[PDB]
Enzyme design. Sequence first.
Site, PDB file in Angstrom:
ATOM      1  N   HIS B 121       2.003 -10.135 -10.798  1.00 16.84           N
ATOM      2  CA  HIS B 121       0.892  -9.223 -11.073  1.00 16.84           C
ATOM      3  C   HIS B 121       1.466  -7.844 -11.369  1.00 16.84           C
ATOM      4  O   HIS B 121       2.499  -7.486 -10.811  1.00 16.84           O
ATOM      5  CB  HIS B 121       0.061  -9.173  -9.799  1.00 16.84           C
ATOM      6  CG  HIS B 121      -1.238  -8.469  -9.920  1.00 16.84           C
ATOM      7  ND1 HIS B 121      -1.330  -7.060 -10.000  1.00 16.84           N
ATOM      8  CD2 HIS B 121      -2.505  -8.966  -9.903  1.00 16.84           C
ATOM      9  CE1 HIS B 121      -2.609  -6.747 -10.074  1.00 16.84           C
ATOM     10  NE2 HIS B 121      -3.349  -7.900  -9.972  1.00 16.84           N
ATOM     11  N   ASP B 198       4.817  -9.629  -2.292  1.00 14.26           N
ATOM     12  CA  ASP B 198       3.432  -9.416  -2.700  1.00 14.26           C
ATOM     13  C   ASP B 198       2.603 -10.574  -2.152  1.00 14.26           C
ATOM     14  O   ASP B 198       2.613 -11.680  -2.744  1.00 14.26           O
ATOM     15  CB  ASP B 198       3.307  -9.240  -4.213  1.00 14.26           C
ATOM     16  CG  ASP B 198       1.857  -9.204  -4.683  1.00 14.26           C
ATOM     17  OD1 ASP B 198       0.946  -9.378  -3.868  1.00 14.26           O
ATOM     18  OD2 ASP B 198       1.649  -9.084  -5.876  1.00 14.26           O
ATOM     19  N   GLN B 201      -2.334 -12.729  -2.724  1.00  9.24           N
ATOM     20  CA  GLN B 201      -2.995 -14.010  -2.934  1.00  9.24           C
ATOM     21  C   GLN B 201      -2.684 -15.018  -1.804  1.00  9.24           C
ATOM     22  O   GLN B 201      -3.440 -15.991  -1.591  1.00  9.24           O
ATOM     23  CB  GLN B 201      -2.688 -14.544  -4.330  1.00  9.24           C
ATOM     24  CG  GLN B 201      -3.273 -15.941  -4.592  1.00  9.24           C
ATOM     25  CD  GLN B 201      -4.780 -15.961  -4.603  1.00  9.24           C
ATOM     26  OE1 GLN B 201      -5.420 -14.976  -4.966  1.00  9.24           O
ATOM     27  NE2 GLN B 201      -5.369 -17.104  -4.302  1.00  9.24           N
ATOM     28  N   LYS B 224      -9.566  -9.365  -0.497  1.00  9.44           N
ATOM     29  CA  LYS B 224      -9.346 -10.754  -0.926  1.00  9.44           C
ATOM     30  C   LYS B 224      -9.514 -11.739   0.237  1.00  9.44           C
ATOM     31  O   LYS B 224      -9.629 -12.942   0.021  1.00  9.44           O
ATOM     32  CB  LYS B 224      -8.051 -10.907  -1.732  1.00  9.44           C
ATOM     33  CG  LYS B 224      -8.178 -10.464  -3.187  1.00  9.44           C
ATOM     34  CD  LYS B 224      -6.886 -10.611  -3.968  1.00  9.44           C
ATOM     35  CE  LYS B 224      -6.395 -12.058  -4.062  1.00  9.44           C
ATOM     36  NZ  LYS B 224      -5.768 -12.330  -5.395  1.00  9.44           N
ATOM     37  N   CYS B 361      -4.223  -9.345 -14.995  1.00  8.71           N
ATOM     38  CA  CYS B 361      -3.212  -8.357 -14.627  1.00  8.71           C
ATOM     39  C   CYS B 361      -1.795  -8.968 -14.583  1.00  8.71           C
ATOM     40  O   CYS B 361      -0.933  -8.549 -13.774  1.00  8.71           O
ATOM     41  CB  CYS B 361      -3.502  -7.756 -13.248  1.00  8.71           C
ATOM     42  SG  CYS B 361      -5.138  -6.987 -13.017  1.00  8.71           S
TER      43      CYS B 361
HETATM   44  C1  LIG Z   1      -0.777 -11.445  -6.343  1.00  8.80           C
HETATM   45  C2  LIG Z   1      -1.538 -10.222  -6.447  1.00  8.80           C
HETATM   46  N1  LIG Z   1      -0.878  -9.048  -6.347  1.00  8.80           N
HETATM   47  C3  LIG Z   1      -1.528  -7.825  -6.431  1.00  8.80           C
HETATM   48  C4  LIG Z   1      -2.905  -7.727  -6.607  1.00  8.80           C
HETATM   49  C5  LIG Z   1      -3.500  -6.459  -6.643  1.00  8.80           C
HETATM   50  O1  LIG Z   1      -4.123  -6.314  -5.331  1.00  8.80           O
HETATM   51  P1  LIG Z   1      -5.226  -5.120  -5.201  1.00  8.80           P
HETATM   52  O2  LIG Z   1      -6.037  -5.027  -6.536  1.00  8.80           O
HETATM   53  O3  LIG Z   1      -6.101  -5.515  -3.985  1.00  8.80           O
HETATM   54  O4  LIG Z   1      -4.497  -3.835  -5.006  1.00  8.80           O
HETATM   55  C6  LIG Z   1      -3.652  -8.907  -6.685  1.00  8.80           C
HETATM   56  C7  LIG Z   1      -5.045  -8.809  -6.894  1.00  8.80           C
HETATM   57  N2  LIG Z   1      -5.469  -9.827  -7.911  1.00  8.80           N
HETATM   58  C8  LIG Z   1      -6.612  -9.804  -8.610  1.00  8.80           C
HETATM   59  C9  LIG Z   1      -7.540  -8.619  -8.450  1.00  8.80           C
HETATM   60  C10 LIG Z   1      -8.542  -8.481  -9.452  1.00  8.80           C
HETATM   61  N3  LIG Z   1      -9.408  -8.367 -10.161  1.00  8.80           N
HETATM   62  C11 LIG Z   1      -6.945 -10.973  -9.523  1.00  8.80           C
HETATM   63  O5  LIG Z   1      -8.004 -11.050 -10.175  1.00  8.80           O
HETATM   64  O6  LIG Z   1      -6.134 -11.888  -9.590  1.00  8.80           O
HETATM   65  C12 LIG Z   1      -2.946 -10.159  -6.607  1.00  8.80           C
HETATM   66  O7  LIG Z   1      -3.663 -11.332  -6.636  1.00  8.80           O
END
Ligand SMILES: Cc1ncc(COP(=O)(O)O)c(C/N=C(\CC#N)C(=O)O)c1O
Lengths: 406, 406
Positions: B121, B198, B201, B224, B361
């Site tokens: 991400h 990270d 998830q 989440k 992302c």
């Molecule tokens: C593996 C992983 N690493 C970082 C993030 C970002 O976390 P956050 O948005 O809570 O700061 C996420 C958040 N992922 C999203 C958030 C949105 N929309 C997604 O749709 O997959 C993530 O899943």
Amino acid sequence: MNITDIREQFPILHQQVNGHDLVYLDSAATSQKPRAVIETLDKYYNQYNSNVHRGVHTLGTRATDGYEGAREKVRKFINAKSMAEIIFTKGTTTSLNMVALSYARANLKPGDEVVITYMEHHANIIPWQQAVKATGATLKYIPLQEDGTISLEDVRETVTSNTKIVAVSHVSNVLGTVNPIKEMAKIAHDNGAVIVVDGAQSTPHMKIDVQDLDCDFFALSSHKMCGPTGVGVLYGKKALLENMEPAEFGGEMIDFVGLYESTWKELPWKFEAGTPIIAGAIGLGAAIDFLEEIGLDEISRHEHKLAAYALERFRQLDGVTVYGPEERAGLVTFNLDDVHPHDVATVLDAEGIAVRAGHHCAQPLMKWLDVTATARASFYLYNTEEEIDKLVEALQKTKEYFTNVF
Amino acid sequence: MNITDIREQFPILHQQVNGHDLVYLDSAATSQKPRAVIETLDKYYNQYNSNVHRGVHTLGTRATDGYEGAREKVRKFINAKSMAEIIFTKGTTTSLNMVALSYARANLKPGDEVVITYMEHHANIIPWQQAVKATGATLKYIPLQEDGTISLEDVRETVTSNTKIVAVSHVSNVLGTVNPIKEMAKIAHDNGAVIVVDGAQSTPHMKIDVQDLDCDFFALSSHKMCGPTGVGVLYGKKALLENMEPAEFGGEMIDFVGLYESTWKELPWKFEAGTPIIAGAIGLGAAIDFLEEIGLDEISRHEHKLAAYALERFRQLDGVTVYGPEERAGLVTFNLDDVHPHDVATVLDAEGIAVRAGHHCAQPLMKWLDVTATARASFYLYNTEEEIDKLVEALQKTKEYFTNVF
Ligand SMILES: Cc1ncc(COP(=O)(O)O)c(C/N=C(\CC#N)C(=O)O)c1O
Ligand SMILES: Cc1ncc(COP(=O)(O)O)c(C/N=C(\CC#N)C(=O)O)c1O
């Protein structure tokens, strides 16, 4: 403005502490929330919680419209020209750090000055300490006059044409002083500086107009203004924010991501990395709707009355020092001669009365006041003169009680 | 684990969208909250809201005990040794930025390497881009195997004795891959690197044990995992956090403030500047109580069942590509041949069904998948096989509908 109708909206006020009705006089530390705000959070989580800015499913659209809608409510509330100038952050502290990181650290060189004042909360001190250290620039303090106000003369004296940044508080969280922000913005600009305004104590309590104040940056905290914890705003002039790099990096704030190099979103999203403070910002919007419906001028008049009444009834007590000027926002910092403020606060809590004792995150100010600690009562739209009577009655009791011990 | 009893706790699930029962399959973007969490926030604002760490009035003590108590709940939940290793932040993104700012930028010199992977991400990409650029260090990517997993062989290949940091995701938010974090921590350490995990998830969906994983840092997001928005955690080994400077400066995180120089609090407060995310952290604590009461292993088993069922029923559709491995967390990213995923998502919403379409992302990952966009269904403890039937039935309908147009 009916205070009984207002207090009816704040469930937390109707309870006892230590067998006495609660008297909450600590709104400068944090404010209480009306039903309108709490039910905003409930409705968000009960009904339309989702991530924002995708706009592909129904709940996602609703969440996004809530969050973006609250940005608009903040914009109108402080009279910014553009939503691009409104950045949601975790709080005043983070907002001020962003300016220190993204603006200061990129625009200061040896010989440059950052000008602050002796009355500043830490949040408006340490970031500048770190920024001048990082850049070999110089930090200077505007002196205070004896009543704890600032003279424009002293401002012209301290701000030079090597000053890049003036950073000052709108309203002091300790002295109650309302600083001459507008005239300070003029002096800043005349010398080629930006001004950064710490608005944490002003915003909840009086009308803010960044067009009139001509501040370059202005910072505020939801928790102090009937809104949820964990949320604040950084306002900055669009032309300055366009030239600042982001303070944090990640999803949501990017446009193209390659392996090594990325490009950023337009303002304001440039400065909002990761899933944002969705429910909090929406509740901050509800808080703003609530305050505007009462009227900031009304809330201000109310506080003028409580402060004038408090200052009078404090002068009816022997052995009590009050700090700061006669003309003030809605709080009073003080000491009982020969009672430590920690003890005053402890004894007040036994009577139901919530105040703060300590440095109030203004250690330099306490040094200037030549004390190590003080006690503070702070007011908001739900406080009454009757509650000020209980406070002064309790201080009289405290004085007598500690006389008895010795 | 009774799914009807679980769904009864989530008010938001019981509603219709576009005349159809809501089918929420977007938990990887954000999760829904049970009553236990929402009522935690209500009770906080209705009953004991106050600022924390003073401990002079009753509500202040209660708020502080709530906030500190939640730190303990997070500590036990991920099996950290110490509350000093648990820092509350705004989210995964901010947590990862702090490591990039305070650890990376202070410990990287030309010739040093940061190693990431192609599946990351953005939150686990851009901070490292910026940190290597700031320091003239070098960023490298571990390649992916064809099913979107990582081989330890490739890890030994990419990590050298010039690698200072390995940063990788626990579970992919796109592929569903569970990475071999523990073996990766070993390779990191063998070469003199720290590993940054990270956990956004993984954390909501499976038991986390930082003692067993031996990660140096681990980042997660409340939103989440059934918890409030605006809050996350940075875990870091106490010995590393002791040596890192703070990322933000202000009240609460200081010990002595002079005019020019300040000293910091002990961990964890060193890293918590300004009024903290009080209600959010307390609600995150409630979320953790809720998940532990069901059991992370139970939630995991449930997701294994939904994922296996989903992968099977997806293979019963012609013209549908699924990305990533067979062994996976509880989500499926996919495309219909000749239907843009944006359109799939739009058509699914008309049927009540919430999915995500776009880059998720992970722009580098999409490039590696040789696509410009995908659609994604993501599961949690409230989802059912019946809801997976509706999804696959709706995709069949979508395929036929878009056949009709051409
Ligand atoms: C593996 C992983 N690493 C970082 C993030 C970002 O976390 P956050 O948005 O809570 O700061 C996420 C958040 N992922 C999203 C958030 C949105 N929309 C997604 O749709 O997959 C993530 O899943
Ligand atoms: C003028 C001024 N400037 C900065 C802050 C810090 O805001 P925050 O803790 O919301 O980040 C505050 C918060 N003040 C507090 C917060 C606490 N406790 C107080 O007790 O006076 C402030 O009043």
